Structures are given as structure tokens and as C-alpha cells.
Amino acid sequence: AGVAKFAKYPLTFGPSPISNLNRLSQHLGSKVNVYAKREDCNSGLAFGGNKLRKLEYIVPDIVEGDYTHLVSIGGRQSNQTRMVAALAAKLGKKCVLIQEDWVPIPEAEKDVYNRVGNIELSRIMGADVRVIEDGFDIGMRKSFANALQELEDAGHKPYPIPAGCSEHKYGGLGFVGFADEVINQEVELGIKFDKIVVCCVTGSTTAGILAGMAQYGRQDDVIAIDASFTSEKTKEQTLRIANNTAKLIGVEHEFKDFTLDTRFAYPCYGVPNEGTIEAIRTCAEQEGVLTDPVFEGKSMQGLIALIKEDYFKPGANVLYVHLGGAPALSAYSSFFPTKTA
Amino acid sequence: AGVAKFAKYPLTFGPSPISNLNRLSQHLGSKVNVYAKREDCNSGLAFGGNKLRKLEYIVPDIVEGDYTHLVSIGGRQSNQTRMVAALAAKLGKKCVLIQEDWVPIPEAEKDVYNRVGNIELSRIMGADVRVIEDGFDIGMRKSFANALQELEDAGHKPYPIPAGCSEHKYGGLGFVGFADEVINQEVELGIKFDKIVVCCVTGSTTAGILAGMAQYGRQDDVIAIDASFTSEKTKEQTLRIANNTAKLIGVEHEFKDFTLDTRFAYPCYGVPNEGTIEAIRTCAEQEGVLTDPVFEGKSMQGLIALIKEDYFKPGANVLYVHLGGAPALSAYSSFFPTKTA
């Protein structure tokens, strides 16, 4: 073990807080005690989020080396790119973002969906936002590739940052430190967490938590709720990252598999189902915490489902990992009508 | 030290952090060292913000007695209403929000202003929203009273929460504590702040800082920035709340006036000017910090304007106060076209 041997650049206030959602717990039958590690309350940089934790280990590279532009990629309401933008700004460097068509832009939303939410913030931060129309994929893209070359031939030095940082060499380190941090907060809080629920789409967050938790032999505490709907390639890339990050930090353990619940990614990436919406409501109504229809909502419904079906031992302390993404809620305004009194 | 005498209910994560906007400082000629107390990253309750700090000293009364409904009031894209709804969610009480029309909805944002941003969030938290046509006015409102009586007649027990908690009995205690934090934080920073810049509209925020900073005889360090474009009723309500609060905390010093720069409320409350957009973007492009069109962008352009006219001592440490309100930015996307490189 040793994430400590890796250069880190501060992009957050420090250990993200842990909220005690004791009210949402009772509402769900008091079967478990739900807690939430607020990564959505990461830093001052454009609403923060899980991405900032990842970026903290990639930045040093960008700074030591000589670069000029930071180019990343993601969907329309990509939280990722919005943070690379904020990052680029804070680092005083140019930024090129490739917004692809990863989600079937719902009808009563194709008006705002492309200019009201996360993408808007990237522009406001002065990023070179580029709207392209390609499919959804958690791997390396050709568009991302050409964009890179474009800048190079232009005489610049582009810094590549794959979707969600996941496939990046150090894309898994940020959440390794997330485990160290959780272990420490368990002691200060006087609360041991039996399980950790986290949304998974491109990997790294879960992989990092897996490799990190492994340092204490607790990898199995993890429960990733798929939100990509492409479970197959998702579990393969997550596991691929987990083993690399483990090798990096010195963890000998070999990840052959992990808990990846797939019952909630439907209909598909970026589109919430009746369940997602119900979960966002329930959580918002009970704790005043906001979750989005693309990720947190689904991981939340998932959390709610498992609790329902008495998946956890009676009284178990479950740590829900709120990764953020609430700023993209304005591109889904149509999914939440007003409640009757 | 008369603020510790009042009961306080935890709604935030603790003492708000201070960011060192050193890059924005270099950009602006290195005239002064700008910092920013992040009230926008103070809670896990729907993005947080200043209202929450105020609400902390008001919640005790809500739980002490027996109230069923929490009713507040504000513009369509009000932050106050959004947070009150989150509080209602948390306290397990019911909510009813009055969204008056205080802003001349830009012709370009007409199909968004009442469905996106803050208003969307309130609805998700199950807040009983009510879009009324009453105009702008920080003072008490008719629609407000009508709602209290209505509910009260329905056989309920409402709890009055004025616009921004400003005209509430304890509405000023909130930021009195803010002052305390500032003095303490100066210590932990090894530096002293020469000035404090803060947006100002309904009152209690600056009022609380004044009453508070006064405990240290530094009320003059405060530099409010109007955003209402109705300085008279604002300066008078502020000054009023300021003296009302000062009495509760013990501070004898009576406030007869204060520094309220009114050069940027133009053209009016809710609508930004080219300077606001310039500011919002400058800050966004320099630090990755997002400020809104309605409040923070103006107090931010004011801060920028003041630094140009060399208003501060060379190398002065000015503490900008970020009160949040970035969630309504989605209702002003029209004002931010993609930049050119």
C-alpha cells in the first residue's frame, strides 16, 4: 500500500464530510442507518464532485510537464468536463471540451438540454466547448483523438484526460485516498460502515475504492450500482483499473470480480426510469439532498431497493457515496411536476 | 460575545472555508490579495448558501413550539425559498413557497425562468410552490400574510419566514457568528483582512456582519454592494436590522449609516449588466468559481471595479464573501455565449 508515494495537487477543502441521513433511514423502515459521504460538496471549483478527487493526482503531471491545453470528453451534461474546465481555469491554462451525444435527449428538453446545466458552466469558465454527435462509450474515442492532434498541429501541448479520468494512468488513485479517509472518519465519528454504495459507469471511482479498501482487506464492503446499462464492458473496465491501481499502490490482492448491481441502469445511460425519479424525490423530500437522473438518482434508487429487500443485515451502517452531478438537474426539469400539497 | 447566548441548530458543515483567489489577484494587476469565505459550500442541503447560516438560529424556535408548515417568500429564482424547502424537508415539516415576480424575465429566458434552477429544486423537495404576480419588494408582502391566514384557517400551524429571513427577529444573529469566524480565521491564517465585500439586497446578511464586526470595532471594514437597485429601502432595512441585532448581542454602538456601493445594481434587481457578465466570466475564467447574474456577479463586478480605482491599500487583504446562489445560473444561460479562442 501507499497512495502517499504519489504526487497530489489540492483541489478540495480536505476530507469530504459525511452526512447522517437518519430521516431517510426511518422513512425506509429503519432497517438500516444510511450515511452519505458528500463528494458533491468537494470544493469551491464549479460545484465540485468526484472528478476533482481523481484530478488531484493527475494535475501534478500537467504542472511539472509543460502543457498549454487540457482536453477531456464526455456527454452533454458531463460533470467531468465541467470540472476539467474549472480545473483548467484554476491552473491558468486553456481547455477544450468534447461534448458528445451520449444521451437520447428527451423531447420536451432538447431545447435547454444543450445549453442549460453543466455545459453552460464550461462555457462561462471560458472553455472551448465543442458539441459533436457521437454515441455513448466508456472507452477511448476517435473524436477525443483528433481534437488532440488538432491542437498539436496548431503548435500547442495538449493534455489528454479520458472520459471520467478512469482510463488515465492515475485515474484510480483519488479514491484510494477516499478509502484511507473513510477509515479515518470511522474512528472520529465512532461509526463503522458495513457497506459502501457507489454509482459506477466509467470505473475509476469504484476501482479506486476497491483497491483502496483492499489495503484493509475490506474490498467486499463495496457495492457498485451500474448506471451505464452496459454492465458487460463496465465491469471489465472497472476491474481492469482496479488491478492497475492496486499494482500502483502496492496492493498485492488481485481483483477477479466485484459486486455490480445491474437492475437499475434501465432504460439506458442518461435516461431515468420511474424508479430513478421516485428515488430522487424520496431523498430530496426526506433529507433535502439532491441527486441527478443520470447517476446519483439510480445509485440512490438502487440503495433504496436493496434496503427494501432487506439486503443488508438488520441495523447495518451503509455509506452512500454521493458523487455530485446535481447541477445537471436543470436539463431534466420536465421529469418533476409539482406535488399536490 | 452576545451571540453564544442564542440557541443554534446545525445546518452547515461548520466554519465556512476561505479560498485564496491568488490567480484572480494577479490578473487584476496584483493591487490586492483577494480571498473568499465560501458560504456557497457551507452545507449538504441543496447546494447550501447564506440563508442556511441565518436559518440555523431560527430552527430552534420551529422545533421548540408546534408548527406544521414552513412558509417563506421570494422571487421566482429565489435561493431563500430553495433552502427553506430543504430545511422543511429536513425538519420533517411541510412547505409552501411564494414565488413572486420580482424580475423582468429576459425575453430570451422566458421558457426557463419558471421551470429551471432554484424553483425546480424546491419542487423536487416537495415544496408547495406558488407563482404569484406581485412585484419586487424586500419589505413584508400581502401574498405572504394571505398564505399564513389561509393555512392557519385550514387548521394548520404555519411558521413565518420573511424574504431572506432578514426581517425575522433573529434573522441577523446568523452573520453575527460569521464575524466571529472571520476574526478566528484571520488568526489561523496569520493575516488580517482589511475589508469585507458582500452583496446586499434584503438586509440581514450585511446587517449581521455589521453588528458582528462591530463587537471588534471594525464595522467600517464592511463594504456592501447593492443588487436591488432600490438602495433607499434596502439601506434603511439593513441599518434597521443592524441596530435590532446589535441590541440582542449586546453591542451598544448604534448604526446610523454604512458603506453601500450602489454602482452596479443596474439596470435592476434580477437583471445583470455587461459588467456583471464580464465579472462572472472573469472570476469563472480565473479561479473556477461560479457567481450568479443576480447577486454575486454584481458584488463581484463591484469588487473588481473597486480594485481598478485603487480603492484599497496596496497589497490589502480583501475578503470577498461568496453567498452562493449559482443554481439559478441555468435560468440565465442566454447571457453566456460560448467564448472564442
Swiss-Prot record, chains A, B:
The modification N6-(pyridoxal phosphate)lysine is found at K51. It catalyses: 1-aminocyclopropane-1-carboxylate + H2O = 2-oxobutanoate + NH4(+). It is an enzyme of class 3 (hydrolase). Its EC number is 3.5.99.7. The active site is at S78. InterPro entries: ACCD_DCysDesulf (IPR027278), ACP_carboxylate_deaminase (IPR005965), TrpB-like_PALP (IPR001926), TrpB-like_PALP_sf (IPR036052). GO terms for biological process: amine catabolic process. One of its GO terms (molecular function) is D-cysteine desulfhydrase activity. Disulfide bonds: none annotated. Signal peptide: none annotated. Pfam families: PALP. It comes from the Eukaryota. Keywords: Acetylation, Hydrolase, Pyridoxal phosphate. Its cofactor is pyridoxal 5'-phosphate. The modification N-acetylserine is found at A1. Belongs to the ACC deaminase/D-cysteine desulfhydrase family. Homodimer. Catalyzes a cyclopropane ring-opening reaction, the irreversible conversion of 1-aminocyclopropane-1-carboxylate (ACC) to ammonia and alpha-ketobutyrate. This is 1-aminocyclopropane-1-carboxylate deaminase. The lineage of its organism: Eukaryota, Fungi, Dikarya, Ascomycota, Saccharomycotina.
